[PDB]
Each structure stands twice: as structure tokens, then as C-alpha cells.
From Swiss-Prot, chain A:
Residues that coordinate or bind Ca(2+): N417, D419, E466, E471
Organism encoding this protein: Homo sapiens
Record-annotated disulphide pairs: none
SUPFAM superfamilies (UniProt xref): Cysteine proteinases, E set domains, Transglutaminase, two C-terminal domains
Protein task: Factor XIII is activated by thrombin and calcium ion to a transglutaminase that catalyzes the formation of gamma-glutamyl-epsilon-lysine cross-links between fibrin chains, thus stabilizing the fibrin clot. Also cross-link alpha-2-plasmin inhibitor, or fibronectin, to the alpha chains of fibrin.
Result for mutant: R696G: In FA13AD; mild; decreased intracellular protein abundance; loss of protein-glutamine gamma-glutamyltransferase activity; decreased alpha-2-antiplasmin to fibrin cross-linking activity; decreased rate of fibrin gamma chain cross-linking activity; decreased rate of fibrin alpha chain cross-linking activity; decreased clot fiber thickness
Annotated spans, Disordered: 1-19
Localization, UniProt: Cytoplasm; Secreted
Glycosylation site residues: N594
Protein name per Swiss-Prot or TrEMBL: Coagulation factor XIII A chain
């Protein structure tokens, strides 16, 4: 029936059919998967770290199982085979129903088994899985082909077996050829998210926690909620392409609700989150989108999803990101007739930093050469389909402008290759392009280094160094495939009468004043008069201004070779009042060389140094033994913070925790003593954060070393 | 009455027409090029080492010049421009006539001279060349505008200016972004060529000598000989493409005439050469192809040509090399039914090693992603054009199998990716495919390291690791574009009943004996019988055999789970009698599994270790001072060597020299002392070679540090 299709879609790893026990000789008393987390199997499969009771193993690699019989296995007349099935509608044709046959010799990526030793009643087999196997939780049944009918085992929940990707197996589409890379990109459950701005790069630890109790199952849960076809779950392109779309909630849909309002009335403010665990568990339990996440939060969660299933993944930060670009390689900045920054239209904003992920895999859907790191960005933005995550887009294709190859490459290409165009919004409704900035746009792309907590400059992966031939070509190539530069930048724009002008912003602290030094370097043998303008705005990290806080203006003169340094002083009581969550200010320093009428423009942004939370541990750093932990946060502002949430986190040390303090008087210090009883050995981190209805985006971490 | 085209073709850099001296009174008195080898132009341009009087500069980078006039330059009403010309038929629109406009600012990308200092009568200019400028020797003039026409300087050879490629300039196609690479790949005039065979890698020094007196000019003559269009000489692609085709003399036209017969009667044996200088110089003087070279020699000479012009280049040795393929990805080995190697037609051999060049350049003719190193092989072979050099083929396209992108890619692809196919030529005229060896060809690809004389493995730039997924798809895309697998290994080869046969081989020196150990190992729980055969040939380094010095047979019995090792001693008496120039030896060890009918084939090659020449310097190692050199050669044979020639070279230390010895008694020792007076200091190197009739391909090198003259 259902003229649509013979058997209904097999899309729930949770739905299960029960295979018939009896459609005759030999019957299995017991099956012995050599589970145990210190045992050969999990260990050799690099799955020993999952807090999981069932056997977890990796596709394309063998494992041992011992089947116990009612009487010696007799190789002459006795015949049996293992079965692996998934979904409510297996179909051997589709990979959901898999019969492992007892064979002589195991060969290249082909399901198979070998009696590796047989004794009184027990055969120890070495079963191998196919490197293209589907990823999920399978059911195992041992069948015996009696001449009358096949009689198989019963539904035994204790034999459920998970099969994950295997970055270690050379035939797996997700194979990382380096061990160091595999520990970092797959095995590490802690990571670092780089934020702030290029000149003042800040960092913060995040608990990926892929091995934490219940994550594996919820990742499977995610795909089910996505009705993801089971035969697709063994393909990296689709897992990631589908997973990435569930991360951000489209009303009731995905995992996290996005929010960039400095309030966060009904959820946990994005800045609060210490890791993924907290979020995924809440999702599963609630079966509803978690309240409030933002760009680096979406990447943190998605990175858990990839590393848990076994796909090599990493979080990347782009400095000065052209998100919401619609494939335009030009961001507009509108100027006033005189030269001041116009604000009627200057709605487009660059992000101080933007976080997206990179997943490792091959691309057999593309020419050979585009495999490796694929950029996937769960933070939606309009693409060909309409406001969705973007990618996988091959980084290597991004780099050379082959934006015609799939998964939204152009929208991820324009994020790191746009030109700033400064235009004059004249009177007669006309516009004139003054100057163009081709270098602000994707200054630094960074990711946590394999070594430890340092940053790693991966900029050259997405782009070539400026002025070199290829760079001009890559850009001109992307333009052939749909990327657009609408404002013809006719010919040249400026010359600056070779008047140079920069300006450093002394990185201050919350509440402190700081100076903003402006600099003109007259390189010519002439005298020029300049009317430079200063516009300082309070902005969200996305670059959306909340209000302009200081708008000074300078007449300055540069005689032939007159290098003249002008200086402003930003006053604490001036910004302190309207500051937003990340404490970033943005400045616009435009200018007009009155002689030639060369508008000069530069902009930068700065973040106010908010200070660390202090975590200190007293006690015995030994697994299974109490350890006391102290989080100490000192209210830096001279104002009282109210309803202060402090969060302690640490994979292997504690389940994420929260506590509240009604208030914290100005300049006061609070203390939180919490005992943790670890279960993981080695290098671990405690992670902390603080959020109050006033200030937030404060963190702290400590690397403790534990043993047994 | 010249209807083909209006202006004849401008194809010689050596030809010059004369520019009219007339068609106001600011006449130039003289011109000052700051072209002393210590001066700032040659030094800032990295052309300080170049035994050349004239100014040598590089595209896209400014250099200082100074003109003196008869009466002070008045900017308000004086007009003049420096002009640079090439060939007998210059033309502005064809970039062979360059009127340098006196700008007020150096425009990035175009020609323009900026006035730097003006101090009375003299104007000191800062001239800037276009990074896409034609490479060659231009003529310089100063034109002074006059209401009644144009006033121009006379022909002045003193001012002839050379413009070359610029690896240091970012707008240049030839731009290498790492200083140390620019050093190795461009300024280094000494190089090492790797040879022998995969697991006994021999090395020898080769003198590129790109800076020696006269080479630069010889390079320009190579292009004139080819009648290469001047407008095209600023193109690394066209340059290497045209340059490469002149190395192998296709009858009269060309630098070298290759010969591989081991006799080399009427010329110089290819193993005697010490570097390129000797060859290129012999070529211009005679104006005819130089007698005898083989692949590594072709690669050496062409390396000089490249580096000397300014295009980064390096020599690459490929290990088991499938030359002369026809874009075919399979190599035929013909068995008998017994298992013996049939030589009825098993005419295709894999070269022990093959040398080719790599030029660093951009590939604006292909999609972005194909710039970098491009292989160019001046050893002809049949491509779509018909028995020519192959390349430039981009090494990324190759590693990726994107072999549809220009400059003979499938042919270079196949040199490094062939499969060995063992086929049985059944007596009824039928053939069976027994075994297929996918990992023999292109085992290792090496090149001299950036640091010093070491070896660097560049294997993974040509291929992905044999075994992974990306390695398969590459191969399959190669098949989508012209590479072919004639035979179809029809789902079979499999594990030949689980019997691993292998054979290690030691390696002695000429005159010594050695032995082989064939190790058959039964990995199954069964008794097995095997009939093995050993074919032991004497080969030319290109695999071409001259004779089978030994033929064996064994019958073995492999009990369940066991090992077995047949050892065989090669008496130095069989091979010594008929060894070839490079002391190469090849072994085939085939073997049939009686019960399963499974065929096990394995082949390896061996070069015999030859004792080196010893070089000894004595005296003061200083620029200008005399230095005594000693070449000591020990005839490792038991016959009297007749007509022995010893060669000495060392760019910057000596012009290459050769000396003869009518004969040399058994095991004896012969020595030569030649005094040398270096003119270049720092780390130098002497290189020597010996060739006789009976023996050749023996070398020697010595690094020396010449301190400077106070």
C-alpha cells in the first residue's frame, strides 16, 4: 500500500522492529562483547573515554566478541552469522540490515568475521565493519541457519553497539593522517574560543564534553528529530550538512534560540554558558530549543556534535567578519558632505569577530583537491535557499575563489574578503565613492593550537597575502561564480596627498579613562590643512551601534614632513553608562585634506578589559577523591551587581553548576566553595563565568592535574 | 610587397636598427649607471654575482641612474624621456620600445622614472620597470624634445642594460615568497644530482655556473636561435616552454645531442660532464649541438638556463621511472607458462631513475590553484605533439589527476603512476594477467635540500599515499582525461595463496662478489611447493638490458606456517665481463605455486659501488691567491685503463679543465695537481670526474671556503 513507496522511510535510530526468534541445531547461551573501558576493544577503538556502558567501536576496524554455545561449534555441520540492524525498517540493500558472515579471511572494508579461536562451546570472533558503515546505535542478533528455518537470538539491550566514524582508519572518509591532530580534533573535550578584536585578542575555555554521560545519545537524538534518513548517517557531508541546521532553532525546530538583545529576559544569557553539556542535556530533556545562544555558542555545540560522532572538528574565529553579506564583496560606509560619518545609511556593520566551524572530511562530490577542512557556519544568513547555516564549503575552494562548488561557498567567501567602501551621501541624491579599504575585512583567522591553549594563525588557508598575483586572481574568480562587487570602484579613489593618518587606541579597563592617539604623517614637501573628525560608538560585537558617545572634531596642519600627533582622552564617565555585554567601543576617524579634498578614513574598535574570575583548588587531586574549589569574583564596578549567577564547569571534574548572589556591593568580593569528586585523570580545567542583570562576560579557568 | 604583416618579426635580441639622432639645446653630456658589482643597483637587485660589465637589473624594481646635461634641467619648459629598446623592429604596443615617462611618483605596475635629486646640470633618476617586462638586453637612449623635433643620444654599448625575472618582487609571476628559497633556487650555482637506485641513492655535484663569464649571453642566444618572439620573452611559461625544446637537438637545432650507446665515439660521454658552463660555451662557439648528454645532463643545462634568467628552478630525480609511456598507466611484463621471464617482447623497461626540472611560476592560463612548481622534462617522449619535451605541467594538477590542463600532463603523470603488469604469453597466442604491481613505479622522488647537499623527499607533491581514498580518485580523474589502462586487471591478482616471496640483495664494489636471499614465507596452514626462477640482467640505467649474466631455478617446499630463504652468490666473474657504464644490474625473481597455480613476481635493481676521486686543495684559500689542487684517482680494476680523462670544475674557482692519461696500471694511483686562483669567495666546491673507455661515471667533489682578499 502507500503507493508512494514500498517500505516507509527508516529515519529514527530510536524506532525499532523486533526480528523473529524462530523463522534445527546449535544455540547461543551468551555473547561476549569485550566491552569494559580498559579492555582491548574500547581501548583499541579510542572510545574508552565515553561514559558509556554499551560497546562503542569505530567503523572500518575490528573488535572481538565471544559467543558461547550449548555444545561445541562443529565447523562441518554448524552454521551461524551475526546480524546488525537499525531503524524500524531495515533493508539489507540500504545498509540498515547487516548480516555478518563467518569467513576465512577478512578483507578491505567489507563486513566480515573470523573464528579466531574456538574452544569448549566458545568461538571468539574478530568482526570487522565497513568503513562506510552508518553511524548510530545498532542491535546485534546471532542467527543459526537450521535446515528448517533460521532461529535467532532475542532482543538483548545489553548488546547494543555504537559505531562511530573512525578518523584512524585509512579508508574512512574522515581519516586524519596525524595522531596529534586526532587527539586534538577528535579526542579533546575542552577547547578555547578566541574573541575580542584583532589588536586585543581575548580567550576563554569551553567544555566540549563529548564523552560526558548522555551526549552521544542526544547527538543521535538530534538526527532523529531532524528525521534524518538512516542511510545518510554514515556520510560526513550530510551529517554535518543536516546537523549544522538543527543547531539554530527556527521556531520549535533546532537546539538553540539566537538572541542579540542585551537583555535576555527568558533564558540563560549567551555569555553565561561554560560549555556544551549544559545545553545538550537541557535540549534533550526539554525537547525544546534552549534559550539564547550566539555565534560562538552555536559553534561550541556543533563542535561537540562532530567530535562525539567522530568527525574531526574545530572552532575558528574571523576578525572583522562580513556576515549577512548576501554575496556582496563590498560593505558600505556613508559619509556626510563635509566629511563626517553619515548615519542614515551606514546600517551595514562588520563583526569584531565571528565564530564558525571547520570539519574534516573528503569531498567525492567535488573535483579531487577540495577535501580536508570544510567550513560550516551554523549562524544563519541568507543564502541561495534562504537564511540558513552555510556549507560545508571547502576552505581550499574559498581560498582560490571556486565558489561554484557547493555548500554556499560564496557567502562564506565574502565573510572574509569584502572591501570597505566609503561613499559621500551628497545633496542632489548623488553618491561619490571616496576611498576603499581592502584590508580591514578578514584580518586574522585563528583557532586553538594543537599544542595547548595558544592561538594558531590559520589566515593563509582562507586567503593569499595581498598584492601577490594569485590573490587578485582568486578574487576575480569568485566574481565569475556569482560573488558581486556592485559599486564599480571606477578607477582609483584617493591619494591622500600622501598624507598618512593612523591612530592607536590605548586598551583600557572597565571604568578607566584612556587615550586615543591620532597620527598624521605628512610625507610630502607641502603644507596641508586637515579637518579630521572623531565619532565613537557603543556597539554590540556584531558592530550594531547602540549610540554615539563622543564626537570631537580637529583642524590640524601638517607642514612639509610635519609628523603631527593629536590626542584625545576618552572619559570613563562618558561610556560607562551605556556599555553593552562585550564592552566594545568603535571609532570612526575620517578626515579631509582641505587642499586636494582627499577624505581619509580609518576605524578600529576596542574592548574594555573586564577581569578574570579566580578559581583555586585545595585538596587531593586524585580521581574519586574530594577536591575543594573556590571561585572568587570581585565586583570591579563601583556600582552594585544584582542577581549574580556564577557558573562552575569542568569535564571530568564536575557537572556544570550555577549559584546566585542577590547582590555584590560595589568593589565587593564573594566566594563560592564547591567540592568536586573527579572521575577523569590527567590534564583538566575548571571553567567559570559570571552573569548578572548588570555586567557579564566574565570568565576564569584553572588547569588541575589529576591521577589514580 | 609584404602582405603577410606590416612590420617584420622582431625575433633576435642580438639585432639592432639605429635610432635617429634627430627626429632643445638640453643635450646630454653623459649617462651614469651605478653598475659596479659593489654598487647599490647590482646589490639591491641581486645581480652582483654575474661576471658582467653591463648594468643588470630586474623587472618591477627601481634602479638609480644619472644624466648630465649641457645646461641645467629647467622643469618649466624642458622635456625628455629615457627610452629602452630591443631588436631591429621595436614597437611601443608590443613592449619592445619603452619610452620612460618622467613622472612625479613611481606608479606601481608601470614604467616611470622619478626625479630624485636635481643639483645643477645633473638629474639623478630613480627608474622603475614593469613587472611584466620582456627579459633581455635592451639599449638605452635619452630623448630631448625640441619644437622642431626630437633630440636623441647615440648608440652607446656602455649603457646596454639587462633586465631579468624578479623572484623578489611581488608583482612578478616568478615571485618566490621565501628568501632562503630564492637563494637555493636562483642564486645557488652549485647543485647535486641524485642517482643510482631507490635504496642505494648515489649523489654527485653539478656546476650550474649561471653567473660565470658568458653564460647569460649564451642563454639569450638560445632564444635567438629558436627565433623566439621578443614580446614573449617576459613569459616564464613561454620561456620554459621554448627553452626546454632547445635542449635536445632535434637534428642540428638544439644545445645537446643525446646518446645512450655506452660507446660515445664521436663526442664526450654524458657521464664526463661536470656542469653546464662547458656545454653552453661549446654550443655558442660552434653553433651546433654539443655531443652527448642524457637525462640528468639535459636537466643540468636547462637548470642553468632557468636560474640564469631568474626563474626559480630545481632538478628532480624520479625513482622507478616509466618513461616513454604513451599516457599509458600500465607497464607490460611477459612471462612464459613455466614462470620464466619471456623477453620475446617485454620491451618496456622502467628507468632506474629519471631527472627532470621544476620551475617556479604562476599559471595564469589555468584555474587558480595551479601555480607553484611545474615539471618540464626536456628528455623528449611522444606526447600529443610528437616526440618533444613535456611541460610545463603543473605538479598540483598532476597529484590531483587533473591531467586535461595544458602542457603534456598525462605523460608526466604516467612517469610517476604506472602499474607493473605481469602477463603470461600462452603458446596458443593468448595472454593471462597473473600479478599486478601498483607500488613499483615512482617509489621515491627526491631533490637537493634547501639547507645543503642533502636529499629531500618530494614524493608527496606528485602523489597521495598509495593506499588512501584520495589516491584512488586522483587516478580515476586521470582516466577521465586521456591516461589509459589498456589491460583490465579483471578483479584478480588477490593474495597468491598467502605466500610472501621477497629477496634482499647486498651490494659490493666492482670486482667483488655478492649474494641474494630469496625469502619465501608460507603464511597459511598448508604444505606448498614452488618452482622459482632468477633472471639476472646487466642493464643501462634506463632499464634497457644488454645481457643475462645468470639464470637459476629452485623448487621449494613450504610446510604449514614457515619460512624459507634461498641464498645465491653472484660470482664477480659473470657480471664483471660485461657491465655497462653505470654498473647497473637487474634481477627478476618469478615463482609459481604448483598447487594453486599462483604466480609470485618480484624485481629489483642494483648498482655497484665505485670508489670516488679524491680532491685535495693546498696553499692559501683566498680570492686572488694561488691554490693548489690535487685530484687522485685509483683505478679499481685489474686491467690497464687506456685514454683516461680527468675533469676539474668549480664555478668561481676555475674554468672547467680536463686532462688525459694514456693508460693506468691495475689498482694503481694517478694524480693531478692544477693551480687555481679563485675570484669568488665564501663556500665554493671543486668537482671532478673521470671517464675512460673501460670505466666511467666515477666522481669526486670537495667543499672549500675561500676567504676574501683584504
Amino acid at each position: 500500500f502507500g503507493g508512494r513507496r514500498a517500505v516507509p522511510p527508516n529515519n529514527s535510530n530510536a524506532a525499532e522492529d523486533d526480528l523473529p526468534t524462530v523463522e534445527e541445531f546449535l544455540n547461543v547461551t551468551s555473547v561476549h562483547l569485550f566491552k569494559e573501558r580498559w579492555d582491548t576493544n574500547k581501548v583499541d577503538h579510542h572510545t574508552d573515554k565515553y561514559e558509556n556502558n554499551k560497546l562503542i567501536v569505530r567503523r572500518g576496524q575490528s573488535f572481538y566478541v565471544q559467543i558461547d554455545f550449548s555444545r561445541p561449534y562443529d565447523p562441518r555441520r554448524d552454521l551461524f552469522r551475526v546480524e546488525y540492524v537499525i531503524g524500524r525498517y531495515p533493508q539489507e540493500n540500504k545498509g540498515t540490515y547487516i548480516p555478518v558472515p563467518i569467513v576465512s579471511e577478512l578483507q578491505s572494508g567489507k563486513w566480515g568475521a573470523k573464528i579466531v579461536m574456538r574452544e569448549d562451546r566458545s568461538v571468539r570472533l574478530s568482526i570487522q565493519s565497513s568503513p562506510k558503515c552508518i553511524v548510530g546505535k545498532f542491535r546485534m542478533y546471532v542467527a543459526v541457519w537450521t535446515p528448517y528455518g533460521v532461529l535467532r537470538t532475542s532482543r538483548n539491550p545489553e548488546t547494543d553497539t555504537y559505531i562511530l566514524f573512525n578518523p584512524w582508519c585509512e579508508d574512512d572518509a574522515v581519516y586524519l593522517d596525524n595522531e596529534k591532530e586526532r587527539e586534538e580534533y577528535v579526542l579533546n573535550d575542552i577547547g578555547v574560543i578566541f574573541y575580542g578584536e584583532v589588536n586585543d585578542i581575548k580567550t576563554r575555555s569551553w567544555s566540549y564534553g563529548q564523552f560526558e554521560d548522555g551526549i552521544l545519545d542526544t547527538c543521535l537524538y538530534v538526527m532523529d528529530r531532524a528525521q534524518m534518513d538512516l542511510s545518510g548517517r554514515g556520510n560526513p557531508i550530510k551529517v554535518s550538512r543536516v546537523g549544522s541546521a538543527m543547531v539554530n532553532a527556527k521556531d520549535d525546530e533546532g537546539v538553540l534560540v539566537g538572541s542579540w538583545d542585551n537583555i535576555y529576559a527568558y533564558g540563560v544569557p549567551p555569555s553565561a554558558w561554560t560549555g556544551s553539556v549544559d545545553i545538550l542535556l537541557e535540549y534533550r530533556s526539554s525537547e525544546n530549543p534552549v534559550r539564547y545562544g550566539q555565534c560562538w555558542v552555536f559553534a561550541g555545540v556543533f563542535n561537540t556534535f562532530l567530535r562525539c560522532l567522530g568527525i574531526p572538528a574545530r572552532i575558528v574565529t574571523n576578525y572583522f567578519s562580513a556576515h549577512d553579506n548576501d554575496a556582496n564583496l563590498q560593505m558600505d560606509i556613508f559619509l556626510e558632505e563635509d566629511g563626517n560619518v553619515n548615519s542614515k545609511l551606514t546600517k551595514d556593520s562588520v563583526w569584531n569577530y565571528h565564530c564558525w566551524n571547520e570539519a574534516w572530511m573528503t569531498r567525492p562530490d567535488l573535483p579531487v583537491g577540495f577535501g580536508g577542512w570544510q567550513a560550516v557556519d551554523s549562524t544563519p544568513q541568507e543564502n541561495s535557499d534562504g537564511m540558513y547555516r552555510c556549507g560545508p564549503a571547502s576552505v581550499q575552494a574559498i581560498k582560490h575563489g571556486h565558489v561554484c562548488f557547493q555548500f554556499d561557498a560564496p557567502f562564506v567567501f565574502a565573510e572574509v574578503n569584502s572591501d570597505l567602501i566609503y561613499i559621500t551621501a551628497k545633496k542632489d541624491g548623488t553618491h561619490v565613492v571616496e576611498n576603499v579599504d581592502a584590508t580591514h575585512i578578514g584580518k586574522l583567522i585563528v583557532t586553538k593550537q594543537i599544542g595547548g591553549d595558544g592561538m594558531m594563525d590559520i589566515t593563509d588557508t582562507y586567503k593569499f597575502q595581498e598584492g601577490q598575483e594569485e590573490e587578485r586572481l582568486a578574487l576575480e574568480t569568485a566574481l565569475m561564480y556569482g560573488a558581486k562587487k556592485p559599486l564599480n570602484t571606477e578607477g582609483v579613489m584617493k591619494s591622500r596627498s600622501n598624507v598618512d593618518m593612523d591612530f592607536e587606541v590605548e586598551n583600557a579597563v572597565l571604568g578607566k579613562d584612556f587615550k586615543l592617539s591620532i597620527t598624521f604623517r605628512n610625507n610630502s614637501h607641502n603644507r596641508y590643512t586637515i579637518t579630521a573628525y572623531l565619532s565613537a560608538n557603543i556597539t554590540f560585537y556584531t558592530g550594531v551601534p547602540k549610540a554615539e558617545f563622543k564626537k570631537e572634531t580637529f583642524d590640524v596642519t601638517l607642514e612639509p614632513l610635519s609628523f603631527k600627533k593629536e590626542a584625545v582622552l576618552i572619559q570613563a564617565g562618558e561610556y560607562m553608562g551605556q556599555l553593552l555585554e562585550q564592552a566594545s567601543l568603535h571609532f570612526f576617524v575620517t578626515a579631509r585634506i582641505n587642499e586636494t579634498r582627499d577624505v581619509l578614513a580609518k576605524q578600529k574598535s576596542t574592548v574594555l578589559t573586564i577581569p578574570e574570575i579566580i578559581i583555586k583548588v585545595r585538596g587531593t587531586q586524585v580521581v574519586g577523591s574530594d577536591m575543594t574549589v573556590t571561585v572568587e569574583f570581585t565586583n570591579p564596578l563601583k556600582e552594585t551587581l544584582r542577581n549574580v549567577w556564577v557558573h562552575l564547569d569542568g569535564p571530568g571534574v564536575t557537572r556544570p553548576m550555577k549559584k546566585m548572589f542577590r547582590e555584590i556591593r560595589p568593589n565587593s568580593t564573594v566566594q563560592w566553595e564547591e567540592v568536586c569528586r573527579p572521575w577523569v585523570s590527567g590534564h583538566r580545567k575548571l571553567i567559570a563565568s559570571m552573569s548578572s542583570d548588570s555586567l557579564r562576560h566574565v570568565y576564569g579557568e584553572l588547569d588541575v592535574q589529576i591521577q589514580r
